[PDB]
């Protein structure tokens, strides 16, 4: 029931506490970094492709 809930979180909700983050391109709630509003997977995808500034795999 993904894309429904995508619409649902992208809507406002009757009170602010119900508001939750999911990644904007993949409707995935968990492992979201709210700076990027990306999940861990898509973070890897894009930072490997070079599409996310700053980022460089470390040590």
């Amino acid at each position: 029931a993904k894309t429904s809930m995508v619409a649902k979180q992208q809507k406002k909700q009757k009170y602010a506490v119900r508001e939750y983050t999911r990644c904007e391109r993949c409707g995935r709630p968990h492992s979201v970094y709210r700076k990027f509003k990306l999940c861990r997977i898509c973070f890897r995808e894009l930072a490997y492709k070079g599409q996310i500034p700053g980022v460089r795999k470390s040590w």
Binding site: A47, G54, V55, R56, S58, W59
Partner: protein, 100 residues
């Protein structure tokens, strides 16, 4: 004393150094009374992921995001150097911030 102070934030040292050198030479070319380039502690964040799709939390991939910070002051300004600084809107991946 009567000083301009400019902050450069960049994700890359080998470009922020040259941008700094540009603006510094422009100030001590179109004026005088310039401070040096001043490194600042260079923040770095780090986001840690599990290399997987479903489980295997034991494996990780650690990504750093550096943020180099480089400060310069122009002592005792003149409008020539003011103009030749504000008339340099370069480069792209560096946030300059003037303070007066």
């Amino acid at each position: 004393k009567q000083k301009i102070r400019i902050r450069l934030k960049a994700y890359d040292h080998r470009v922020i150094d040259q941008s700094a050198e540009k603006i510094v030479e422009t100030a001590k070319r179109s004026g005088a009374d310039v401070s040096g380039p001043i490194p600042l502690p260079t923040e770095k964040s780090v986001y840690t992921i599990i290399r997987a799709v479903h489980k295997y939390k034991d494996s990780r991939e650690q990504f750093e995001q550096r943020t180099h910070k480089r400060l310069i002051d122009i002592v005792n300004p003149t409008p020539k150097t003011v103009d030749a600084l504000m008339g340099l809107n370069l480069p792209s991946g560096v946030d300059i911030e003037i303070k007066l």
